[PDB]
Amino acid sequence: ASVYAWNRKRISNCVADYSVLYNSASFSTFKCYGVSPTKLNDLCFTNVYADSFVIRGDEVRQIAPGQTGKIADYNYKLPDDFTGCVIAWNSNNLDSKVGGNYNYRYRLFRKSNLKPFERDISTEIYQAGSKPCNGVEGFNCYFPLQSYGFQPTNGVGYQPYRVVVLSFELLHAPATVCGPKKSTNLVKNKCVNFNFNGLTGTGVLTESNKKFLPFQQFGRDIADTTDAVRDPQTLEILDITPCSFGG
């Protein structure tokens, strides 16, 4: 959608692989402000918000933490404590039109600068002077929404660029979106250390004949010492024995 009608999307309760998007050389601009993109795969938040639109190629500077501009002031504003990243890429091959892609419009005239995460949807004719504007444009009347004359031949700076701004919110509710875990393979009959689904400890893992009822995860016998565990990826009952020691 156009910049004055920026598309806001909410995503939660899924695994996100930020690496592949990071490992994408076909994307023009990838600027991260919260943390390093490589580290992003590890930590996680409770939900994600995406602000997607298309602007002019020369206006990409406007979308930045604590940045001002016509697009930044009257179409979409940002705070300085932004967490997340910004992705941009040219769309002249798609959005630029030989007949002119005048569908895309932006708010040039507005009484006040737009607030962060706020949209101005009114198409009110603006008053640049002191006289009121009643319907048809007069002296101090100019259309708030200027269209775009994108052409296939307009140089790099004038091409339409798609921009998606990704923010991660970490409300007190439990985290819903997190990166993958990268489970390894399995070994047996050797003193190793394990971290099955967050339950850690050392020992030797052998086969067992116990019968876990189909909703338990692990079993301890007495004095609260874990004996059996159930492998998340194969669903079988293992057994744990401490590694040998003695005087």
């Binding site: 002119g100 040039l108 002296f139 100019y142 259309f143 004359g149 307009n154 140089g155």
Partner: protein, 596 residues
Amino acid sequence: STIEEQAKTFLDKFNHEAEDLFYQSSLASWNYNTNITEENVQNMNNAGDKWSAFLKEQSTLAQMYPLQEIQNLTVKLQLQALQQNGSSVLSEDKSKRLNTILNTMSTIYSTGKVCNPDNPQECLLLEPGLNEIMANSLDYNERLWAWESWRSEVGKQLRPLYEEYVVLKNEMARANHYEDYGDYWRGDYEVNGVDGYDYSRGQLIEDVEHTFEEIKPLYEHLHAYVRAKLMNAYPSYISPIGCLPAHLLGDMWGRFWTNLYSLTVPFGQKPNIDVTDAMVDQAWDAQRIFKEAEKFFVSVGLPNMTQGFWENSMLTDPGNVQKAVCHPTAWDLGKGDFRILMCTKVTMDDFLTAHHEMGHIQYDMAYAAQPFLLRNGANEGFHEAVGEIMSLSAATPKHLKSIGLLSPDFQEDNETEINFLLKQALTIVGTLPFTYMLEKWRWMVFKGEIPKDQWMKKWWEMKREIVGVVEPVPHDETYCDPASLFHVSNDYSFIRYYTRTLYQFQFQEALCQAAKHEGPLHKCDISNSTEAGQKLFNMLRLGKSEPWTLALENVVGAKNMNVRPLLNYFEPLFTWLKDQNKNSFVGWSTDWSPYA
């Protein structure tokens, strides 16, 4: 809200919609010139009429803003362009008569028609042929006859026509509250902005001749050399006291002596430095020509060329039904789109022409950030001066050997230096007196102190002293000689060319200092000096957003006008001519005539 913010909003609203429509019109123009076709003619009609019908209204609504309180002088100058009466201030009848009379002057000049007496049924034009014959010849009769006929069929019926044009254009000047149209022309070189940087229309007139007499010490010596070579070539047809007629100047208006250069060759043993054999032998095409020009500019300091230019711009071979006029042009269509248009050829002269046009293109990108009303130069002469700067810089022998155009073992001496300097001065300084006299004559025919009769006879009697043209057949009343000139009938300001040579001389001099070169200015190369390119960009990026007087403060610190580079460039020629025409006396007398 104060009116000034309303002015800013209105200007932004105007230029936003103006940029796209101007881009559409420029795209149509480039399509028509790249594709000579009937349909593109109607495209030009339907784009130009739309652009005019859009711009005229915006200029018309530029009156309710009181443009006298804007604190930002840049915004004031931006609003100044729209707050211009233009051509609609006049009444309908006078304006349409003026347009018609401009049309008839243009048609008459483009249709110069004279028949030789042996073939009165088939005339010839200024097209190659008769014009070539009267421009490339060693004779006295045919050139004189052609000059007389041209003045008697373009100047005979254009005297009242040009009188009406002058009086009506000056009346339109009063319609703009100007007592003369010369003031309207000089308004380009006039700013009332920064105190101490301001200028007036009047002062330019006097300073044009204030810098004209300083080159005349060299002009007299060059005229004496030309007269001596005429004595050795034209037998007893030029008086030793006097000077040469109009038809013996190589050009029918005395513009350049290049056609007369062969007569006044200094020394033919050492010819001009021509790399055409090497240029072809290296197998460098127009694409390689443009690439090498780009590399030379990068060494100078200007950045890489934008993409699409390799695709949108045309370079050579109009060829087939896909016709394309290739008059060397640079096209800034706006919206970050640029094109260049030539029949670029494998030649050193064509190499320099391509350098000129691509330097124009580079300056076109230089003011990219400025709005539509500021995407220009400080003055119209700076663009052409820049465009000739690298043309000067791309032909120097050091530059040729640096990129391997000349042979690795090529050396120059005094003879080739003298020949090159004389040939160059036959074009550069040989037109400055003619340029000055034409500009001043136009100023005094606009002012109107001289009566109707003192128009062509006065022009000739002044050309006798300034350019040095005797009258084999004088033109008193029934002929209009200046009317037989291209830039007299199309409303063309002509002082721009006069200032362009001085400006480019100053810029080349300053770059020569800020390029680490030693020796004479004509042997100066400014390649492989990135600081020179940085200074160039500092000059260029200002654009129309800054006054021309302010612009003339970094490259040269003299906001006024100087003539030092003109004297310094042709210094070896002057010192050679001092000892060359030792026996003959310099100067010419304005009393002898070929008829008596």
